[PDB]
């Protein structure tokens, strides 16, 4: 019922802060489950070796301050709320060819009564691709996308890949190319600023090969 979901959203957000990490002790690391969903190759520049892909950047974490009791709100166990209103780990795509960080659309999130969040915002990424020179009578190229939190480091927000591979379940195949291979690898990355404090990326790559 509308009335209960209205009240629910008000009650949840009266004393909410989107600025603080949703943790009880500030030593807790927020666990974010990350997954890249590849949807469609929408452009292929062979001169500059750039491919524009349509993706969704699927994210999952738990916000402890957004739990509720379903009996208080007519048995409602989930709501959709705008992603602008909540705290987010600020996971971004980079190694982008034209415009260094990828702009991701802010779709609504699925929230549930345990404070679980699922967010699957769409984006357009532009990879740079390396030509694979091992054996290419049939041409092959390797395109990769890095994911990581823009500001938070590994001792505040840990990103964890949901799978070893990018999700190709809603991937619309091409007429010219085929994805030979595709994996995700998580890395610990260190920067000059910060000897003691690591950062985290997940690099998804796919090798696209031309059909005969």
């Amino acid at each position, epitope marked *: 019922k509308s*009335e*209960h979901e209205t*009240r*629910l959203e008000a*009650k*949840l957000f*009266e*004393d*909410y802060s989107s600025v603080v990490r949703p943790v009880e002790d500030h030593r807790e690391i927020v666990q974010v489950t990350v997954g890249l969903q590849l949807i469609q190759l929408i452009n292929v520049d062979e001169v500059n070796q750039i491919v524009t892909t349509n993706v969704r950047l699927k994210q999952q974490w738990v916000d402890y*301050n*957004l*739990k*509720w*009791n*379903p*009996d*208080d*709100y*007519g*048995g409602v166990k989930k709501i959709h709320i705008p992603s602008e209103k909540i705290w987010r780990p600020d996971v971004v795509l980079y190694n982008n060819a034209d415009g260094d960080f990828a702009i991701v659309k802010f779709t609504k999130v699925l929230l549930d009564y345990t404070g679980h969040i699922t967010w699957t915002p769409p984006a357009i990424f532009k990879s740079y691709c390396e030509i694979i020179v091992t054996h290419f009578p049939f041409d092959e190229q390797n395109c990769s996308m890095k994911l990581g939190t823009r500001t938070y480091d590994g001792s505040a927000v840990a990103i964890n890949p949901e799978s070893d591979q990018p999700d190709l379940s809603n991937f619309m195949e091409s007429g010219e190319w085929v994805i030979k291979e595709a994996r995700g690898w998580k890395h610990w990355v260190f920067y000059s600023c910060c000897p003691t404090t690591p950062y985290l990326d997940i690099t998804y790559h796919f090798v696209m090969q031309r059909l005969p």
Partner: antibody
Amino acid sequence: EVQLQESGPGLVQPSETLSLTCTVSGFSLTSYSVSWLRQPSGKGPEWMGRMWDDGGTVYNSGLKSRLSISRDTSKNQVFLKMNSLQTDDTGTYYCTRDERIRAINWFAYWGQGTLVTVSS
Amino acid sequence: DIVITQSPSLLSASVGDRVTLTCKGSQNIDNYLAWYQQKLGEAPKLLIYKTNSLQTGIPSRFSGSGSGTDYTLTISSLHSEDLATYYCYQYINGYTFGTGTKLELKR
């Protein structure tokens, strides 16, 4: 200061409505929610429903059609009406002042109670 | 909803004793658990909420503890005016109450 009193007739004969009242003092009902609980005989307590601080209401889904909660903020009274009674609804009936954290609620205070028994 | 069972059902103990009531849940309660005292013919009084927060006014002899599924109320030195029934209750998944631990004094 923080007080609740539950008033209402001990006897109501079956297949009728039960009308209770919860007179309140120490606080305003506009800033504090008030719930209704009851304990059936030879059983545990259970939450019947709530009068929200914002005027609206929510009910135990099992009692949803029978119940209807209201209030009068000048009289400092919260009312209950519960139609279609029967022998299984025999027990003590309390109203409570609810405290909250974010969207979660719990029962902070109680009144003495009221025994309500259903026989012809 | 989460079913709750209190042990011991009936408890006998003398003044000054360190009694401990338990309250185990059928599912994870995640620390959202309260305790109240019910003397006969009197309004129930809240002792503890959120597992271990002492209610304002309540004696320091009452204390709470637990996590996940198992919870406990402790009365460190038993007074005579603590003779009552003690009910635990849960408030994240519906509103369910404990069966009841009745406290009787040795003499």
